[PDB]
Design an enzyme around this catalytic site. Structure first.
Site, PDB file in Angstrom:
ATOM      1  N   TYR A 167       0.770  -1.250   0.000  1.00 53.06           N
ATOM      2  CA  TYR A 167       0.000   0.000   0.000  1.00 53.06           C
ATOM      3  C   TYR A 167       0.806   1.307   0.000  1.00 53.06           C
ATOM      4  O   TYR A 167       1.927   1.375   0.511  1.00 53.06           O
ATOM      5  CB  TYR A 167      -0.968   0.022   1.192  1.00 53.06           C
ATOM      6  CG  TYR A 167      -1.608   1.377   1.423  1.00 53.06           C
ATOM      7  CD1 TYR A 167      -2.708   1.795   0.674  1.00 53.06           C
ATOM      8  CD2 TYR A 167      -1.063   2.270   2.341  1.00 53.06           C
ATOM      9  CE1 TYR A 167      -3.247   3.078   0.834  1.00 53.06           C
ATOM     10  CE2 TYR A 167      -1.587   3.549   2.506  1.00 53.06           C
ATOM     11  CZ  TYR A 167      -2.676   3.949   1.753  1.00 53.06           C
ATOM     12  OH  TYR A 167      -3.179   5.221   1.926  1.00 53.06           O
TER      13      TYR A 167
ATOM     14  N   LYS B 242      -0.641  -0.333 -14.930  1.00 51.92           N
ATOM     15  CA  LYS B 242      -1.865  -0.307 -14.141  1.00 51.92           C
ATOM     16  C   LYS B 242      -2.475   1.089 -14.118  1.00 51.92           C
ATOM     17  O   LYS B 242      -1.913   2.012 -13.527  1.00 51.92           O
ATOM     18  CB  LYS B 242      -1.581  -0.770 -12.709  1.00 51.92           C
ATOM     19  CG  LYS B 242      -2.000  -2.204 -12.426  1.00 51.92           C
ATOM     20  CD  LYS B 242      -1.581  -2.644 -11.030  1.00 51.92           C
ATOM     21  CE  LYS B 242      -2.280  -3.936 -10.628  1.00 51.92           C
ATOM     22  NZ  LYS B 242      -2.124  -5.007 -11.655  1.00 51.92           N
TER      23      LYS B 242
ATOM     24  N   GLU C 244      -5.990   5.506   6.229  1.00 55.04           N
ATOM     25  CA  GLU C 244      -5.915   4.399   5.282  1.00 55.04           C
ATOM     26  C   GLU C 244      -5.026   3.244   5.730  1.00 55.04           C
ATOM     27  O   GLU C 244      -5.231   2.108   5.311  1.00 55.04           O
ATOM     28  CB  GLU C 244      -5.391   4.889   3.942  1.00 55.04           C
ATOM     29  CG  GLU C 244      -6.204   5.972   3.292  1.00 55.04           C
ATOM     30  CD  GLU C 244      -5.620   6.362   1.950  1.00 55.04           C
ATOM     31  OE1 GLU C 244      -5.544   5.482   1.065  1.00 55.04           O
ATOM     32  OE2 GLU C 244      -5.227   7.535   1.781  1.00 55.04           O
TER      33      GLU C 244
END
EC number: 6.3.3.4
Length: 480
Positions: free
Chosen positions: A337, A432, A371
């Site tokens: 992440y 991506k 997050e």
């Protein structure tokens, strides 16, 4: 067995006068209070498999002092190197205490970790977060009374603080800023905040070779600091360079590696992940969760993140589902992440200006999103840590000039090049909405805020467990 932090969270209080419920799953232990109501009282939430001991430290240096720490410290050897004498601390809480005796509050400017801590020394209270506030910490301050907790919900059940942010949906509860230390005078209830870290604003220039080698070395170290000596860690594997980069480093530091990938009936990244699974030969598992069960995570996501931001909740839905779907014992999990933030991964064009504009903006607004909160995984008993947001890795990635991030027509170039000799070519060069559709089948396209805020008021502001919240009936009430 995967070694976990001495504590995942806590609820503490310091007073002179006069039932903790957490989203985090685990045991509870109340620390002793030697000098009665003058001592720092606290309830620690931790894994049944760990002893809370290392998360609590006491001393008489300066005045009667007690420290409670949730999470862990990564640059331990560095920190031990600046301390006198020889007898090293038994845990991170004691390490903090030793550092405080030497640098006072400036001790926190030296710490690279994933923690939240509360310290009481005399009638002085210190509240500190790691550089990125990866482990949320909240507080309630009033003359003669200070309460602190790793979960705002534990303070909701129960004097405005400047420099701190009010928790949305709550009243009287403040969130300690990321990379900071609040110095509170118990008597007057007055507080002073000192930032102990801030995103670099300048950019560094380096030839490709040096830059690629620096990123590789930094990631390997941050990952090594996050893996237990002889225990195999679990890495959440996706189809990108992010998680694959972490897996390669964890496999090297541990010698072995377990991986897991989650997918829905709408999409998955199993094929991409398989390439890495076989290249490193890890013990892999695939978990597919229906879109319906995915949306049933809404109440848990807001409950664990304690956020009212729909965009954040939507992003965390798949993660909370995966952690809860994990089978087996509690685990130490590493994720890929946050790599996009400092590397401008979401940048598509070749023009560098927009990359830095978005990067600078993201780095000045990450605080409060939560997050990376450990609660997202500890609600299922698992501990998560994120290498890309390690203080050293983060500083390095942020500092690199945009041309090293968007180079040769590829995004996150320096990272891809840094892991080239450790991953398959396809993985390195690989480039991506349910929730919106749910409401789409009820109201006008035109919103979700009210839905999330409702859940928040029930689970965080109120006090109801997500399992008691009907995700359907909630959206129902939110018709017009």
């Amino acid at each position: 067995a995967p070694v976990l932090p001495a504590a995942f969270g806590f609820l503490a209080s310091a007073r002179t006068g006069g039932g903790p419920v957490f989203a985090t799953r685990g045991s509870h232990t109340d620390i002793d209070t030697p000098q009665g109501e003058r001592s720092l009282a606290a309830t620690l939430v931790h894994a049944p498999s760990v002893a809370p001991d290392r998360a609590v430290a006491r001393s008489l240096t300066g005045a009667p002092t007690t420290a409670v720490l949730a999470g862990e410290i990564y640059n331990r050897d560095e920190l031990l190197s600046v301390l006198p004498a020889g007898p090293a601390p038994e845990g991170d809480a004691e390490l903090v205490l030793r550092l405080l005796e030497r640098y006072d509050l400036h001790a926190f400017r030296l710490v690279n970790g994933r923690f939240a801590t509360v310290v009481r020394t005399g009638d002085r209270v210190l509240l500190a977060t790691d550089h990125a506030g990866s482990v949320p910490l909240y507080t309630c301050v009033a003359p003669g009374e200070v309460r602190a907790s790793t979960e705002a919900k534990a303070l909701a059940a129960h004097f405005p603080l400047a420099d701190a942010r009010r928790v949305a949906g709550l009243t009287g509860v403040y969130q300690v800023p990321a990379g900071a230390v609040m110095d509170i005078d118990l008597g007057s209830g007055t507080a002073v905040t000192h930032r102990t870290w801030t995103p670099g604003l300048s950019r560094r220039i380096l030839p490709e070779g040096e830059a690629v080698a620096a990123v590789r070395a930094a990631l390997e170290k941050a990952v090594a600091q996050r893996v237990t000596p002889g225990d195999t860690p679990l890495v959440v594997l996706s189809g990108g360079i992010d998680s694959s980069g972490v897996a390669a480093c964890a496999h090297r530091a541990a010698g072995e590696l377990d991986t897991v990938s989650m997918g829905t009936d709408t999409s998955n990244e199993f094929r991409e992940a398989r390439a890495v699974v076989d290249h490193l030969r890890t013990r892999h598992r695939e978990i597919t969760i229906p879109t319906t069960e995915l949306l049933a995570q809404l109440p848990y996501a807001v409950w664990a993140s304690e956020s009212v931001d729909p965009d954040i909740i939507e992003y965390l839905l798949p993660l909370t589902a995966l952690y809860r779907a994990l089978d087996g014992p509690e685990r130490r999990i590493l994720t890929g992440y946050g790599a996009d933030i400092p590397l401008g991964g979401m940048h598509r064009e070749d023009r560098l200006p927009a990359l830095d504009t978005v990067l600078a903006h993201d780095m000045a607004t990450f605080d409060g999103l939560n997050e990376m909160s450990p609660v997202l995984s500890t609600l299922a008993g698992h501990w998560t840590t994120h290498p890309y947001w390690d203080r050293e890795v983060l500083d390095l990635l942020v500092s690199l000039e945009a041309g090293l991030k968007r180079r040769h027509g590829r995004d996150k170039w320096v990272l891809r090049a840094a892991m080239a000799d450790a991953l398959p070519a396809e993985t390195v060069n690989r480039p991506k909405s349910s929730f919106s559709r749910l409401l789409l089948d009820h109201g006008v396209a035109e919103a979700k805020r009210q839905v999330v805020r409702e859940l928040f008021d029930l689970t965080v502001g109120g006090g109801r467990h997500p399992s008691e919240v009907d995700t359907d009936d909630v959206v129902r009430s939110v018709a017009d």
